[PDB]
Amino acid sequence: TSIHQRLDRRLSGFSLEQPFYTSPEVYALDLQHIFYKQWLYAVPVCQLAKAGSYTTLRVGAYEVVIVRSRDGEVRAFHNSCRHRGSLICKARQGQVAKLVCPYHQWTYELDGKLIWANDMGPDFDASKYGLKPVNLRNLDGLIYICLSDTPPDFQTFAQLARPYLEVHDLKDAKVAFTSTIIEKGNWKLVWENNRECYHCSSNHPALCRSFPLDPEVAGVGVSKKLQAHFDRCEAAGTPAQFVLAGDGQYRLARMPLQEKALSYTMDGKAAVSRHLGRVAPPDAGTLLMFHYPSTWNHFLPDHSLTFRVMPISPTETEVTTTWLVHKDAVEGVDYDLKRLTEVWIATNDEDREIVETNQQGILSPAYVPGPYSPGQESGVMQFVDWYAASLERALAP
Ligand code: FES
Ligand SMILES: [Fe+3]
């Protein structure tokens, strides 16, 4: 059986056949044509708010480092020394003058420029052996990167995005806290969990307090109190109106939080005293922002959350949640760290458990596609479709 044959006979209303979540062949194809080629959420730029700052991430097999120059820009490169391929930047995050390879001290400037290589003598050009760039975009506070040499368009997404995102002044955030977890499920199944709300009824006693459960919010023609809600925000000059890429990849909507909620706290109250950005009115709700395959976010009036989805193996996905708060918000005065993060640390573990159980269930050669609820999983069907369509595009000539 071919992938082509499996993709052919895929009907729209169903979960995928086994090999999409279990086989290393699909994994390889997903790496190849989706993670290595599309735009990926990396890091907010508040991690690199000093020159020389750097951060590193692995994408599939690639070792990337994103760093800030003296010249002010954020460039990103392949973390493999051009001499014999050593990592340059080990530590997760940090600060240097130059990029100095710890094997043989070949030193690069912070724009790649190889400016010293030792006893490489007469035949040696250094113009050939600079660090390999990785295309990189700054999206009003979020660094996305792209490992293809010929990236897709970012700018159309960048342009729908800016207005909903400017009001957060994400450039003026600081990381309060960062959580990595690794879920023992396929990266696709992470997305399926997230693009529904449905299980949430009996799987998240915390979030629910604060986050909607009505499938309109995180589901896929606009209800009546919603335009009203979009309206109060836009009258206010906070963009709120639902918008959804025509390819299905990315989406914008500032959604009302569960009756009364102001933030993702136990008490529905602000998490930080010093709000981030200029969101307005107070109760504008939560900005949802997804972007297949790499991120979803919840941008509140008090603080911001990124999530970064990264695949590790056919049945493992690294999910990185980051808390963003104003740079002058003090821990202990302005916010309390526990209180700032208990809701979602709880919610992410509940999902993980859920994803992990699903994964296991799926590994049964007895598993066959069953049907999505059109009432609760229409947003899941939407992911799967963007997914299949992306694999077909990448696979023709
Ligand atoms: S391997 Fe990097 S300088 Fe030798
Ligand atoms: Fe969930």
Curated annotation (Swiss-Prot):
Monooxygenase involved in the catabolism of stachydrine (L-proline betaine), a source of carbon and nitrogen. Part of a Rieske-type oxygenase system that catalyzes the demethylation of stachydrine to produce N-methyl-L-proline (monomethylproline). Stc2 is the catalytic subunit. Its EC number is 1.14.13.247. PROSITE patterns: RIESKE, RING_HYDROXYL_ALPHA. Pfam families: Rieske, Ring_hydroxyl_A. Homotrimer. The system is probably composed of an oxygenase subunit (Stc2) and two reductase subunits (Stc3 and Stc4). Fe cation binds at H199, H204, D351. Residues 40-145 form the Rieske domain. GO terms for molecular function: 2 iron, 2 sulfur cluster binding; dioxygenase activity; iron ion binding. Binds 1 [2Fe-2S] cluster per subunit. CDD domains: RHO_alpha_C_GbcA-like, Rieske_RO_Alpha_N. It comes from Rhizobium meliloti (strain 1021). Keywords: 2Fe-2S, Iron, Iron-sulfur, Metal-binding, Monooxygenase, NAD, NADP, Oxidoreductase, Plasmid. Belongs to the bacterial ring-hydroxylating dioxygenase alpha subunit family. It is an enzyme of class 1 (oxidoreductase). It catalyses: L-proline betaine + NADH + O2 + H(+) = N-methyl-L-proline + formaldehyde + NAD(+) + H2O; L-proline betaine + NADPH + O2 + H(+) = N-methyl-L-proline + formaldehyde + NADP(+) + H2O. [2Fe-2S] cluster binds at C81, H83, C101, H104. This is Stachydrine N-demethylase. Disruption phenotype: In strain Sm2011, the insertion mutant cannot grow on stachydrine but it can grow on N-methyl proline. Its cofactor is [2Fe-2S] cluster; Fe cation.
